[PDB]
Assembly symmetry: C5
Homo-oligomer: 400 residues x 5
């Protein structure tokens, strides 16, 4: 239309995009800043980078871009592209992107009275410290710092508007708690100039269903299965094989899990503590199984049971465990032969009884060690998990 063509011709006359559009040069220009969170794409634990989808919101009043609607009927708003009008240089201070300005520069919508709007979308990759002390029950507070790169408070004073979460898309791995923010003023040393900024901090809570189903349950199941060695009779030769195979499975699960948590060194993760406890328990179980095996295959002709060990185990433990311990010249010549055979059989029988007593001693230490290790593992696996804060809330939310 000729009206809007004339308006466009008149507006850009003697216009400098390098000039702050204010009526009085000694007064600042008010700029309103806000956010519109859309999607939390990736929370990188290893490299400490949070990737989000954000719609920036800026608004300010211009002095030169005004006109009378009556003179130009039918046209109410005009649009200007990049590099033709002045716009604030608001930048994310703590960015972690190769292109520091990750905003797709769109048009600028203008009032009939100078008010401007600017909503550049973009995917931001900030840098926030991530704590995994209570992983996978952690709650993080990542920050987004925004401010003018070169303008001062006496020239450009930012104002904060409450963040928008209306169009937020829920994420299946992180539960958003809230995104508060507040305006802050930072004075300098030389000069009384304030330097306003708007900082938005994101609070999100990890959803624990996936890890609780794929790591805690299977690992505790293998740990429980490792206790069966104490219920296996020593006559079969599968005790050490079974124990070492559970150890191998635990090592494989360690290999599977090693790639998730980062390489931090500020605090030992809860998953690391629990896995160390489990592997130590399994190793101790293997040691006990070896001791029991060396008790069972004890040589009957070796040293006899010491009185202290006998009275300690076979009496006291049996009392506590409620188990019962099992239990003519030719005529002379043949007489000596049968006597020798009978005495040989008698010696064999007494040696067999001597071996049986050691077998019973091994069988009675086995159940004691079973009870001890069962109590140890249940207590450890309860305490380690219940130590972490907000565990009850996490299991109330992600399981019910």
């Amino acid at each position: 239309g000729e009206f809007q063509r004339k308006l466009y011709k008149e507006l850009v006359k003697n216009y400098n995009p390098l000039e702050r559009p204010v009526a009085n040069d000694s007064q600042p220009l008010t700029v309103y800043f806000s956010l519109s969170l859309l999607q939390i794409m990736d929370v990188d634990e290893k490299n400490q980078v949070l990737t989000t989808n954000i719609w920036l919101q800026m608004s300010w009043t211009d002095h030169y871009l005004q006109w009378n609607v009556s003179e130009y009927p039918g046209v109410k708003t005009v649009r200007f592209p990049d590099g033709q009008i002045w716009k604030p240089d608001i930048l994310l201070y703590n960015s972690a992107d190769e292109r520091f300005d990750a905003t797709f520069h769109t048009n600028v919508l203008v009032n009939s009275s100078g008010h401007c709007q600017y909503l550049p979308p973009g995917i931001f990759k900030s840098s926030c410290y991530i704590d995994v002390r209570w992983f996978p029950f952690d709650v993080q507070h990542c920050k987004l710092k925004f401010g003018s790169w070169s303008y001062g408070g006496w020239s450009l004073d930012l104002q904060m508007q409450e963040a928008d979460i209306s169009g937020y898309i829920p994420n299946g791995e992180w539960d958003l708690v809230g995104i508060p923010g507040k305006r802050s003023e930072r004075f300098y040393e030389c000069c009384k100039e304030p330097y306003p900024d708007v900082t938005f901090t994101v609070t999100m809570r990890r959803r624990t269903l996936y890890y609780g189903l794929n790591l805690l349950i299977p690992c505790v199941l293998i740990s429980a299965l490792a206790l069966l060695v104490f219920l296996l009779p020593a006559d079969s030769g599968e005790k050490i094989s079974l124990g070492i195979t559970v150890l191998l499975s635990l090592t494989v699960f360690m290999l599977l899990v090693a790639e998730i948590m980062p390489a931090t060194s500020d605090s030992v993760p809860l998953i690391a503590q629990y896995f160390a406890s489990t592997m130590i328990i399994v190793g101790l179980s293997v040691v006990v199984t070896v001791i029991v095996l060396q008790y069972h295959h004890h040589d009957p002709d070796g040293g006899k049971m010491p009185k202290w060990t006998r009275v300690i185990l076979l009496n006291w433990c049996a009392w506590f465990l409620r188990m019962k311990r099992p239990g003519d010249p030719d005529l002379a010549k043949i007489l000596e032969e049968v006597r020798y055979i009978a005495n040989r059989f008698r010696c064999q029988d007494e040696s067999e009884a001597v071996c049986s007593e050691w077998k019973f001693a091994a069988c009675v230490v086995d159940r004691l060690c079973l009870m001890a290790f069962s109590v140890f593992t249940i207590i450890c696996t309860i305490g380690i998990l219940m130590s972490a804060p907000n565990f009850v809330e996490a299991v109330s939310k992600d399981f019910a």
Copy 2:
């Protein structure tokens, strides 16, 4: 040619690319929007990104770019590059690309009467929520939202044309069902201005042959092989070794499969349910094998069989399982010697029979547990799979 040179010189005179080309400034400009789906490249389950090959289609009528063919014989169409004529700022709202405008800006083809065409190709990376509750039998509905970034309904009203799938290239992993779309109007709070848009939703069905051949069949084969422990005689010492080796193979297959599904926590995947069932069954089988082994190697001098257990197993189970349970002074001196030897042999024989009865008890509990576990595994592996909807359609399409 001099004719087209003159036409080009005349057309761009007093032309502003920042002006909406309409005859009346108070009336909107009609713009037709459409799509031409070409290829579904990648469906990223973990990061929830769908990558497609798309040819956008836009068309509108211009008012200033008209001429008489008689005045310029031989020339019917003209082409303009980027930044020389006004074009709509149609953008994908829900994009997930670093460059928000992933369209390769091509030329604009012009009528002899102002009609314009614009087909910018590009590879789009949208963000759509992906459900894996019925994985790998899922059907997803990803959306593509298109609309003007700054223009209003009173100025630019979009119109929807049916999508084109003529040049669609079939994908070996996803089966396209259809790509419908409809125009929608969104009114604002202040003002009665409609804000039209065109949303295209893609419906695709996963092809299940690959997963059904590489995951379900091998895993169920190992699960079936794990049942052989109940057919292995207890005299050989390979029962625990075999069971724990099947457990190790299952753990390795878990490690192989862990990397496919995402880390969501909204619903337990069907593959997760089935794998948990299989591993629980294998663990219970190992427990039963340990119990059977401790029954087989029971000490003959220990506690006798309780009457309740004897009558429950050896009579009732044998009835049900249809198996039969197996079954001169020197003269005095030598007489006592041979009597002692004979009595020793008699005691050994009765102890052997006592042990044989326990061996039979173990052999008869073994088959009962075999039957129970076989029924359990077949019922579980049938119910878990048949629970998912459209399973019959999936196996009718991807297997016949």
Copy 3:
């Protein structure tokens, strides 16, 4: 030089880069298209993308860029950069790159009579469907489609020149067969305008030495080693352990191989068929070994051999397998004692013979199952491989 400076000043006067340089506006402009294949970089099986190194070749006659050599002695050719002269907008239709125009825009070399040459190099990432039905013996036909994005046949008619392979660099993984191409005309619905294009299809054959050395040979070696269980005496307790360990090795090799082939679901790959056959054979071998073991440790006091089974195995199989089956009052008191001892020994001997006959039955079923499984595995591993076409040519080329 002043001559070339004057020529450059004169040439660009009143020149519009948006005008088709033709003498008559109603006639088309002939443009010759060709290719110069240089290197096949990557053939992506999973995402179906072929990456090549290409030198495009374009040539056309210009009408405004002509001069007399006598007027400008010493200068024969001139060069123009991007955006200063008109060049055809030839684009790869089926591209799979974020930047749809993957050509590095170089200069344009000009005749003294208007003829132009343009050779923009670039690395192209097209999208071609890849078949892995006969993997790793496949032969693929990937296509490259080239044509003007907006110009018509009445204005710009493409002409095809034979492709150049003089500077082709041989690839160690793919053997190039040839790169033919032909010109095609596509008429529209409204109008009799042809729309010419040039399509180049690449035919390449996979080199099979690497896969044939790293997958087929080792896997068949483990499959052959799995047959040794039938030559192992049952007295040793390593049969089940050996079989399950070969199964574990096969599972590990499956894990190694799983990452190569794509996730397609249109056809079962030959490698998948062969691996399924091998794993099924190994599982059946384990089942047979369990059956043999349960035959060997059969209780001598259990049910006797059925007559049918005895005559079927011990007679017929031995006939076929050519193996031979192995084979004073005190005086009265001592008389009864020695009689009892002798009768006990006699019963023990007959029970031992009864057990020996079952041991022989197991030993004779073992060799029969060995022969059956050996024939099965050799026949399967020959037929599966020889089923694929061009197998003889592949082994003649990549092995001799």
Copy 4:
């Protein structure tokens, strides 16, 4: 404001951005250079690239960009974008980025008297040689070299300002020691022109908690568990199985650890030395276990114990190890029969004693080898770790 508009109009008149702004052409221009370290993002060991977050600081005095504040009240500073004023071409010499200039060009802030400030942020990817001789106890010195690309000392002399670490964000994997720097002058061959530069070297110390918890502790635990073979009685058949299973676990841990350290060949890493020692110890333990087993199952009818071996082991080792070694015609016919039986039993008994002596010899070599291997492993695992410098400081910092 009209004042700042007039000032902007006056400043850029007859201004050439290609001219060095100095009053006297024969004198150099002083430029101050500094740094503001913000974050150490990634220390790439394999490809030797250090990625940091840096805010460059430059300052210099301009001669043409001056004005009187009284003539232009209310305006004190002006800002200029890229390409409108002259700025130094300071570049990182030893960069490892595809875009050699990884700085986001921001505005330039100007005094009222010509002084300029320029703080372009960016993420830098330098290339510094990384030493892993003492990994994971290493301390690296990566360098950042900055200097003008084309200007000389007689025209542009750099000056160094101390680095800023006020806004440094601590990293969980690297502990920053300090970032010193100094100015250096490099004369040329032809000409007495100095060429100043500023080099900043970063000193950082690796935090060892993660590796010390996930690699050293578990590996030494498996190494200790491998010693249990010497406490396992030889009667059970799990010695070789246990040893080879610990070997398999060690191989799996090698596979897990192989991907961390780079592929350098200048020095053997400490972790490589320690792992080689551990695997050699385990292999030697397996060899000793095989020797002990072949001693235990020695045939009683074979060669007798040599006198030298007997006196060396059974006497001296028992002295040192303090273990005790265990310990009528018919009448004639029956007489000969019982005599034959008794002599058979006597020969069996003496053969059993002969075998028992070899069993004791194996049992006594077992404990000697246990002691030797325990001393070897503890000494090796102490010396290898304590060899590295700053080990005490590392364990004092990262563990207390």
Copy 5:
């Protein structure tokens, strides 16, 4: 300064950046080309791409950019940015980068007499065929081809200057041998125009310490450990378990090593040959162990030793191996009873001797196979390694 401002104003008057700056249009322009190698970043074996850090060096004499120093005191050199003066279009012909021009365009330094210098840095990704026939002892010759894209020899004749390696940074994985180069002329078919170019070929030698420490030593150690099966007594039941466990470890090491070498099919790598030899040796050892086991557990009631086998083994091998092979009516009734018992014992004793002879035969074949396999493995592992050329030089450089 006003002098340099005036000089800049005068220089760019009537200057065309599209004109070759020569005094005579019919004469060529001499351009000197050189290189400054800085760092070899990555040598990609799989995709055949060599990434380097390069400083290009170009120099030529300009005719229009000259001035008198007396007229402009104090200014000796001027700098021009991209796109304001003519510069040669030297491009790397065999590039493998998406951006074909990987040079960061810097300024151009100018004499007071027209001489120009241009040093654009950049990271280049060329494409050179990589041979791995002798991996990891290979020496590669990658090439870098440079030449003008459109200018001819009659207009632009390149001249080669020797490469610079003063600032070369040593690489821990590749040892640079040298970077020679030579100028070459390529005539065309139509015309006698030479087309000069400068080609630089890089010769580098791989450092073998890392591979020689992590692959050859551990693999040969496992291969040596696999030979212990022949020193293990057959009475213990760990022979097959040990052999199959070494096989499993070898398979795991194959999985670890599979990802290093590329997927070429032109030649079998030395590492592939050696690994195939090792796995074949281990498989043959397992086969021999099975044969020995089936000899040891031979049934005493089966077929007797054939005379040929007896004389071949028990005599000849024992000769060669120097081992010795081990070694009143009631009165009648009791007489018959004791006679029967004695005859039973005699038959048992002779059967035991018959079994002992087979046990000795197995024990004597075991050591023969041990010697054979030891000789085989040492000879193979020496010959395969020593076959490769420059092996002695590699072990002299990377080990001493």
